[PDB]
Design a protein around this ligand. Sequence first.
Ligand SMILES: O=c1ccn([C@@H]2O[C@H](COP(=O)(O)OP(=O)(O)O)[C@@H](O)[C@H]2O)c(=O)[nH]1
Ligand SMILES: O=c1ccn([C@@H]2O[C@H](COP(=O)(O)OP(=O)(O)O)[C@@H](O)[C@H]2O)c(=O)[nH]1
Ligand SMILES: O=c1ccn([C@@H]2O[C@H](COP(=O)(O)OP(=O)(O)O)[C@@H](O)[C@H]2O)c(=O)[nH]1
Ligand SMILES: OC[C@H]1O[C@](O)(CO)[C@@H](O)[C@@H]1O
Ligand SMILES: OC[C@H]1O[C@](O)(CO)[C@@H](O)[C@@H]1O
Ligand SMILES: OC[C@H]1O[C@](O)(CO)[C@@H](O)[C@@H]1O
Ligand SMILES: [K+]
Ligand SMILES: [K+]
Ligand SMILES: [K+]
Lengths: 163, 793, 781
Amino acid sequence: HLSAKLFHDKESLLPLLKFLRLHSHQGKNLMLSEKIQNLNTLQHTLRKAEEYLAELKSETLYEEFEAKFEEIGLERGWGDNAERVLDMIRLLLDLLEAPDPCTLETFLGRVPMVFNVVILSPHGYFAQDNVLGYPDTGGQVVYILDQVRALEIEMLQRIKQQG
Amino acid sequence: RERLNETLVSERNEVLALLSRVEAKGKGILQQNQIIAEFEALPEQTRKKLEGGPFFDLLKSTQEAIVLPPWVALAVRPRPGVWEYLRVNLHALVVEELQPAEFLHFKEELVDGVKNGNFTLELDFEPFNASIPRPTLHKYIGNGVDFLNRHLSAKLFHDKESLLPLLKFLRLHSHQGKNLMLSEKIQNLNTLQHTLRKAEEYLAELKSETLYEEFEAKFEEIGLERGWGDNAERVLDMIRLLLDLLEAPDPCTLETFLGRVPMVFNVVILSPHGYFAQDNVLGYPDTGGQVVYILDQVRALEIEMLQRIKQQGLNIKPRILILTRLLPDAVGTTCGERLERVYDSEYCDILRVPFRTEKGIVRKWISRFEVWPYLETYTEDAAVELSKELNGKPDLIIGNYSDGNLVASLLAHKLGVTQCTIAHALEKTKYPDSDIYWKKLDDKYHFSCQFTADIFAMNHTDFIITSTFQEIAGSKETVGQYESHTAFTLPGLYRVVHGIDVFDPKFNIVSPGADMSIYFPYTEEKRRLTKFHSEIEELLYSDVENKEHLCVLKDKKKPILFTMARLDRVKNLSGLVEWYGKNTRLRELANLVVVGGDRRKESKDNEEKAEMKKMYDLIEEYKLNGQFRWISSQMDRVRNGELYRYICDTKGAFVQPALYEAFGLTVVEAMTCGLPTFATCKGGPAEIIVHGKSGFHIDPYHGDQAADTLADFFTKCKEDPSHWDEISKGGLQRIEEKYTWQIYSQRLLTLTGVYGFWKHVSNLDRLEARRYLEMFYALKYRPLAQAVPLAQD
Amino acid sequence: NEVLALLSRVEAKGKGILQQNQIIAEFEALPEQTRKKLEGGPFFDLLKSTQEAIVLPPWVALAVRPRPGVWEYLRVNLHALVVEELQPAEFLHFKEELVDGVKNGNFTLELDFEPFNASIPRPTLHKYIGNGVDFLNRHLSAKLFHDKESLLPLLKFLRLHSHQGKNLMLSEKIQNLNTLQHTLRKAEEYLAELKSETLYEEFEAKFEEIGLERGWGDNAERVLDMIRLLLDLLEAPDPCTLETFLGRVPMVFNVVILSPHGYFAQDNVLGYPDTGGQVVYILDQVRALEIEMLQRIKQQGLNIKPRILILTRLLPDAVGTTCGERLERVYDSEYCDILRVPFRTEKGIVRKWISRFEVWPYLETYTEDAAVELSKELNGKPDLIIGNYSDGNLVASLLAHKLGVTQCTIAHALEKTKYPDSDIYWKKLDDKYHFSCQFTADIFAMNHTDFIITSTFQEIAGSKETVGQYESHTAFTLPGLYRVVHGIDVFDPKFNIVSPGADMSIYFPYTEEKRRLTKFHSEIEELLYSDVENKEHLCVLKDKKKPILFTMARLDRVKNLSGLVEWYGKNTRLRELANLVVVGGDRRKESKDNEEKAEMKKMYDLIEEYKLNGQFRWISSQMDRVRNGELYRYICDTKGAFVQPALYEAFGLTVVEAMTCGLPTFATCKGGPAEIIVHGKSGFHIDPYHGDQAADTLADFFTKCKEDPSHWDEISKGGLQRIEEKYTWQIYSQRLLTLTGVYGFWKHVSNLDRLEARRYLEMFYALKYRPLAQAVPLAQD
Ligand SMILES: O=c1ccn([C@@H]2O[C@H](COP(=O)(O)OP(=O)(O)O)[C@@H](O)[C@H]2O)c(=O)[nH]1
Ligand SMILES: O=c1ccn([C@@H]2O[C@H](COP(=O)(O)OP(=O)(O)O)[C@@H](O)[C@H]2O)c(=O)[nH]1
Ligand SMILES: O=c1ccn([C@@H]2O[C@H](COP(=O)(O)OP(=O)(O)O)[C@@H](O)[C@H]2O)c(=O)[nH]1
Ligand SMILES: OC[C@H]1O[C@](O)(CO)[C@@H](O)[C@@H]1O
Ligand SMILES: OC[C@H]1O[C@](O)(CO)[C@@H](O)[C@@H]1O
Ligand SMILES: OC[C@H]1O[C@](O)(CO)[C@@H](O)[C@@H]1O
Ligand SMILES: [K+]
Ligand SMILES: [K+]
Ligand SMILES: [K+]
């Protein structure tokens, strides 16, 4: 539905640009800066970034091209190296051009977002010991402790891959 | 207008950078593109140039600088497919913004002395394009099907009226009175949604390998005819893909489903000009890579069609016709027989139809530039014959080259059939400034007809196939072949404002190949044909001078510098022979063997004739006897294959010195055998070859540098024979990756489906462009075509 | 009735290979058969509705016209029945074989304009035919309603709008709908508290500040109304509001009118070949138009001075006329001028008058020269361009395109309807009439123009029983040349019927005595009743007291004056009752026109053959309208009548003039006069195809009038009233300027769709017209 609604529609695309521009964590800018006010500059800047990156060695760290990227309006979180930053910029350029569902997901899922997470489990005796089997204490408690551990490994990773 | 700014920089680099603007205006009244607009004042300047700053863009992107009034008309190309043209004054401060149809107006004032008429024709196809939006993104150039898919995938998503066409499409679909896919039972999406639902449960239960014959009974009941699959497993997938499009269309699915619907049964391929034959032809005027491409293409195609028909659960038998001219008088050939079976195919047949006038058929061969008056009556006739040969109507028409695309359009329109074009070359890029200088070239080359027909076909066709990206958008530095038709002018005739857009979703790149049984690595000894080594050794090292071969090779042991091609001005064989003759170091390292032209018979082609006079003269001038062997056309590919490998034994190289080459199958063949290849950087081979890895590039405009580059190569190879083996393996790998026949057919068939379905939805949007084209042909081409003198028997 | 139809279809095939028209396509078949008809049944009415049938030996093709604008084409095997529906193009093949023995080249041109018109949906109702601006308003109204993307064009249109460097409407300070919206109510607040009469000068200060430039009105009352109009349009657009607003915006300042063919002058011309109601219409028109143009410009608080140029051909050797001078002021106008420019070639200026059918080779250069000349004359470029007739519409198109101006066209006649079967038989007629050229330009300008003005509904959709003038261009064919599948549509919103009138200074009732111009009576009595025979008049009237049957018109084939004379000549009874006075041809000179010459010889022989002396007075062309007004009134004094025996008449200005004067009128039923007159009420209709019947009818009018004198007055007053309603110049001028506003704007909104049409038309002009036109032989001095 989003892939189809996004295909060559201005009033549609803005939301995605507003998103990346507003995106920040703990007082740091991510993705696009305030330098990019419209799809034209964004389109132009991405293309501009792509020409540059397609030149560099794949394993080149973001810190190298950081200065330049800051110039043209690109904040951190596209990836930790040239290769990664490249696929990502190429991904968004594509959403602007010919959106497909697989692209759309891949990009949105890649954008660093989830950092802080709040999980709700009020009832029961919720603990890591001396509990399981008490009234209301059971599969929910187990699931949640496994979930967070699994969740934390994935986040540290996504965070590190996005530089 | 970014390129009118960095040039505004005459405020900084001025007293230097207005010099190059001098040494140009100092040549005068002409066009110099690139190498001349560049190898001019910049290289021929002094170190007070020092223009290596921000200026080096606008000159590096020009493509032309046309000397002019106290004015310079120039062009600039920021990115493939994006246009800026400049006009500035030398000493007058005349620099002016230039917006298209205005810039052309300045090209006309540079010939006629004034621009074209007033109400003289402007050709703009842009407004007829508005149906789909254009990709602005480089990746989609030559990828259009991928773009059209996503446009359809979206347009299809939860739109009632929008899915109807797909139902109607699958509902009407039939072949020779057999109904396929959906029967007439299913009148609406709800019934189809449901009927498909019912079908799925049933099939999910059956074993994967259950034949369609079992459940055929059930299906006919619910409205499902044949063409879904041969067994249950297949029918299942297919049914699932259709359910999917009805719910959440995604591009990948839409393509796959349209890909599989059994569609292409009878193919009709247009190739009127030349001597089209499978033996005793190649090397003749107008007879060349296009004939090889088509013969290889059809064989490949026939196979894919067979296994697509089998998989889809159908026994229908395909037929592929190759339409071409019947030349009753070409003797020593089969060109005089109406029907001929293609080698190694069950269903591919050559179908020959004669040209004719009200005075009866025309027997004599005719140059490809002169066939124009004949083509419309050819179409009518061909229609009649292929109606005879074909069972039902054509499911695809492929046009080839210029005359071929002209006709295939008329048929496609007449019969209402999906159409594809393949240019195989576009003369405007091959014969420079033939657009603007057209009027003087006309009585020889008749370019007013050819261009007209090329423009007509590009826009008439459903999709276009190119063999490379370069054939469309060129490169960063240089303009592409099709691209160069976006805006041009034929002063006194008409002015093409927007003729084509490289971003058009109809461009698809499908790269051909070299037949693998004919051309393979010289290293596989089991495969080598030694039966030929006597003929070949006579061919090369024989003592005799005759119509088959000229001069002689004193030293039998040198590496051979080899080339083979039709003989005409553009192939530039006379060029290479000269470069070699002037460079003593190359002559010592290698023998030069050029195969081209047929000297066994008197030549009837103007260029062929002119080329021979130059060859003849050079041989004497450069005293080539003993280092040079000029061999006549080799019409048998099997032995040609072994010839290439033989050249490998001598550890030679292959050189292709064309002023322009559209694709260069010889390049592909040479590498497929493993022969390290040096080829012209102008046109297709720029893309085929990767410099210093899979081969080397040379510039036909600097020949002396080419001859030396080669001398270098042989020198290194003498010091380090492993250097040869490295380039050899590089070529072998490049071919194995990019150029092969296996995927070609699949791509091509898939395309026919996607574009076939598409042309139903877009039916109404195109209706205007259709009348615009009808008129262009009738009121533009026809008058021009009847203008051309008829051949006289 | 399976055994029945086979019969009529048999009787049809009996006449063999041919086509026949709807009169015959029935009037022979149905009636000429035995009582075997017994068909009042539903099959019948395919026949009754058939406009023509084309019969080729196995086949009969049918063109059916159920309602104006609605066509069905069928084929029928003359034996075996088997009715099969055919597409227009295929019905056209039928005609083509009928002439060439074969259809047009498989690859020969089909003109189809339908796919280019689709921007607006088409009205299907009879009422919107001729009423297109009404339709287009409702469309723009809806389109505009709470759509920002749709409202922007309105803001930009107004923001860019200017004349000759003076900004108008909105300044550049208004960049968007909020600012416009906010500013407009700011202004409205302010004006509400001013006295209505406050002049725009007082608050002009404020406005400039907030982005409001001049042209909203003269006083505060009027700037307020317009502003409120715009507020509404941004808020809740309705059709009426939209139209009032657009018709109000000052636009038309300079107007250019194209009328190249003929001798265009204010005196010493009328009745000369190719010179007639078009010169009359245009002159009346520019007058009325300048009046309104001035009030509008004044009412909007603008001080600009308008200009109207009538572009026509400079004829150096026309003598006794003003056709040799380059600029001529129009009588009773401060701002209207005739601007003459010569035809010319590589050899230089062409001196001799050339027939309308021959001007084609010259028209493109004319355009360029015309352009250069009106650039010197006009202050700023043209705000409106009106093409007239074919040469006129053609040039109007090219100039409009060249200059980027809103174009209107007026046909004044369409030859295809004047010269039956001149489309299908075009080849044998071409050497003489060059219809391949004309039809081509007719089609070109018809489509290329921004809108169209007709003088009747008949001009578009004709009547219920018969085909209209533009209607007959919907689908037709020129064998061996090209085929028009859909060339025009009677429902195209571009059509507007704006009826013209007669100058009411010149034409009034014969019963207003103080007004009659008596000083002309000596001249008229000599003109009519004198015993002298010369190049001014032939024969003589023996009995002075009889009533006069009066006609006046250009002299040529179609006007059918030679017919009228023969009718009269054959009919003794009419001859006893009334004297026939015909005015046509200028015999003072040698006739340079083919038809005029031919018609003259016919006249002479009719005189001798029917012994017309004593009942018949043949007067040369009366070139002065003022005395003409009184001449009409004189006929009334005698209780006579005006008759107009044309085979076809596009509009009939003389028919309007006669009526305006009180003179009972009998006019042809073929073309415009069929709408103008109401049989038995405002006048009568006669059939030029049945002449003797026409005469008998006239005899009858006079007899009735003889016995009862008040019958003459019923009709006299009947027409007087009719003209008072449908035909006057008062609303014309205002309607026209309104359309220029609506269509002026609509062309900004629709501009992107007219692009495809632009290129189509360009290529049609270039690749089809030009080559045809050049083929026309040039004149020689
Ligand atoms: O005495 C107990 C009772 C339960 N469990 C654990 O609690 C979970 C029970 O979850 P389940 O989803 O099976 O049932 P639920 O408690 O969610 O209703 C399982 O991991 C058990 O191993 C346990 O460890 N000790
Ligand atoms: O004497 C000759 C000359 C030409 N060729 C063949 O002609 C084709 C030429 O194709 P290419 O694209 O290289 O040049 P083209 O003629 O198509 O412009 C190649 O397959 C060659 O092997 C040949 O077999 N013998
Ligand atoms: O000898 C003549 C004949 C014509 N008229 C005028 O020319 C016009 C004829 O216009 P109409 O539309 O009736 O005929 P048209 O010439 O346009 O076909 C009328 O105003 C007549 O009064 C005239 O003044 N003298
Ligand atoms: O309903 C099952 C119960 O067990 C839990 O999993 C807790 O361990 C909760 O979901 C709920 O209290
Ligand atoms: O223009 C090059 C020529 O060579 C061919 O390959 C011959 O088969 C054709 O493409 C064309 O006629
Ligand atoms: O055929 C009709 C003729 O009548 C006129 O109105 C006379 O001026 C012109 O439009 C045309 O020449
Ligand atoms: K951000
Ligand atoms: K079917
Ligand atoms: K303004």
